[PDB]
Design a protein around this nucleic acid. Sequence first.
DNA 1: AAAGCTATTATTAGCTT
DNA 2: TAAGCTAATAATAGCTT
Lengths: 71, 71
Amino acid sequence: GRKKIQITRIMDERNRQVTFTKRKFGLMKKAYELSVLCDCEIALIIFNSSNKLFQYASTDMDKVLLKYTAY
Amino acid sequence: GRKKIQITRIMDERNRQVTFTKRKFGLMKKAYELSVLCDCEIALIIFNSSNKLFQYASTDMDKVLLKYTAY
DNA sequence: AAAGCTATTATTAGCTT
DNA sequence: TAAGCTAATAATAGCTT
Ligand SMILES: Nc1ccccc1NC(=O)CCC/C=C/CC(=O)Nc1ccccc1
């Protein structure tokens, strides 16, 4: 980025929503790439600060989860 | 990297294990940064191709999950 | 070997219209 | 404004020892 930042909670709800949308995309993109490159099951559940749910899974969520609990 | 790659399953078990260890770290690092920067609950469950489990959660893994199912 | 290096591609923080 | 740009930081693929 234009400037290095420090990893601490962004206080401005506006920049926080924006950063959240950029980085959520970035996080799902890498999760997907890791699933394909290395052949693994992955599940990513994300609730933003307003409690809205976002999710990614390399297959049906319900399966990754049960494999976790059965583990 | 030294060369751009294409997103497809790595056929060599050796390079696949190596890429998996590098990128898993990279994926958890971004998940963590997103949790802190934007104040959200996150859960990431990963099973490699040999079925070993790896996981990250911004709180107890089982709390994020219950919040998902209760959702 | 396998732990680390670096040239290179990828992501992104702040800015711009 | 908010959609997109780009200067700059970050991650990593292949190499190095
Ligand atoms: N079908 C499906 C298709 C596409 C995307 C997602 C889904 N899947 C769901 O929409 C619901 C997931 C159900 C979860 C099954 C296992 C489980 O319930 N695991 C658990 C729950 C609470 C606490 C701990 C562990």
